[PDB]
Nucleic acid binder design. Structure first.
Ligand code: MG
Ligand code: MG
Ligand code: MG
Ligand code: MG
Lengths: 246, 248
DNA sequence: CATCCGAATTCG
DNA sequence: CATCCGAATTCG
């Protein structure tokens, strides 16, 4: 009666120490052994690495132009049924919504990920993309459990500007009472991969789910351990979440 | 019967061709002979020049640190009564509100000018300053006619963001039906003093007046400072605004 | 003695 | 092969 998953922007666009960082991401995958992994900022060579070092995950992608998202499904645990790609017609960064329908146990899921439009200056487009995601979450068949997990790039004000989440969609971190230990998934004071001398902190990485049949049990940051090469696996922390279906 | 005035950011911060440009500004003052002139971005030497080349105007200033505003009063037409400076506590650019009470044509006026906080990213402070100005315009007794004219640096929606003009305060341009001939007072297409390649057009320079019972009615609004000087540059990067109003 | 537009870029 | 924060600066 459970699903566990990681969502993680793994910064494929950072060319520094990629082999070692991919190894570290694959270490987290082996150690935490989630059913599903949502990845953003993947690049082709990174896929090839996951194919050898996380071989028990099926990699589902849509378009692979430049950098992209992927959903990884644990073989034997998760059965793929179908995929759907929802475009963001006004994106300037090749962003979109990747949806995968799966079965895990006797439970049907619609798993979605995206990397929403980046940077402060593209707030209006990022908000339009969010609304597109939220609308698609609501369209899913009543019997299916919908989970979105991704790099939303959202900051102060924006979700409110959007009019807030609909009454049957919830943010897992909010649902769990806004625990302080995972309140930031991108934090330049704690993570120095970008060498930014300022301390800025954001909750860019978020999980939304439609529902009280679905109950988040835990949420934790992963990728917190600096690698021997002196770099974190990514500039983002990953999020590990377990949900119970009641 | 009337009042005429010019408001003009004369770009004292542009150090090139200042003497010819000052000569150009003084030419406009002689030719249009306004009762009052509201100037922004004045610098000390520029004041010195006006005292010689527009010597029939009394120059009224508040603080003179760096660059500043001034209000010029035509000697014999306008009688100075008093001045008041209202500070903008959160300014990072030494901006403030300069108010001068005067008598003109047997009528009493409170004339105000300011150079509101500059640049796009200082919208919040600029809006707070606008509120301060608009609030100050309501304080004078109804008998006194209140006129604000200055470089407001305002752009799209900022006035709405502020709650809009109160019901007894009007923008002279809007009042006159938004005439296209003087819409933009800062225009990089038509004015090349900053040599900006792009075409940006703004209405930074604005005139607000308090009416109530229609005792003050704008008659005309025109751009001044449109004539290129011998050096192939204009007096300022802004056009000035010449306005005439009837006291009814 | 300088600033000013604003999209792109730099740099802390 | 790159991006990414955000204030400050560059340059069209
Ligand atoms: Mg990145
Ligand atoms: Mg200037
Ligand atoms: Mg600037
Ligand atoms: Mg940037």
């Amino acid at each position: 009666s459970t699903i566990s998953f990681i969502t993680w922007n793994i910064d494929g666009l950072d060319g520094c120490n990629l082999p070692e960082r991919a190894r570290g991401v694959c270490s987290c995958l082996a150690l935490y052994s989630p059913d599903v992994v949502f990845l953003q900022e993947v690049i082709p060579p990174y896929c090839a690495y996951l194919k050898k070092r996380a071989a028990s995950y099926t990699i589902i992608t849509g378009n692979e132009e430049g950098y992209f998202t992927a959903i990884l499904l644990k073989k034997g645990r998760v059965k793929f049924k179908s995929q759907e790609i929802i475009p963001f017609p006004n994106t300037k960064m090749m962003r979109n919504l990747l949806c995968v329908n799966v079965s895990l146990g006797g439970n049907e899921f619609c798993l979605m990920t995206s990397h929403l439009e980046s940077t402060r200056e593209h707030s209006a487009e990022r908000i339009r993309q969010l609304k597109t995601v939220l609308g698609k979450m609501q369209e899913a068949p009543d019997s299916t459990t919908v989970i979105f997990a991704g790099d939303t790039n959202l900051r102060d004000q924006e979700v409110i500007k959007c009019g807030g989440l609909p009454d049957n969609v919830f943010d897992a971190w909010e649902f769990l009472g806004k625990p302080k230990h995972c309140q930031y998934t991108w934090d330049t004071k704690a993570n120095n991969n970008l060498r930014i001398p300022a301390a800025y902190k954001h909750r860019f990485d978020r999980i939304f789910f439609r529902a009280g049949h679905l109950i988040p049990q835990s949420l934790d940051l992963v990728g917190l351990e600096k690698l021997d090469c002196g770099r974190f696996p990514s500039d983002h922390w990953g999020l590990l979440c377990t949900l119970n279906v009641v």
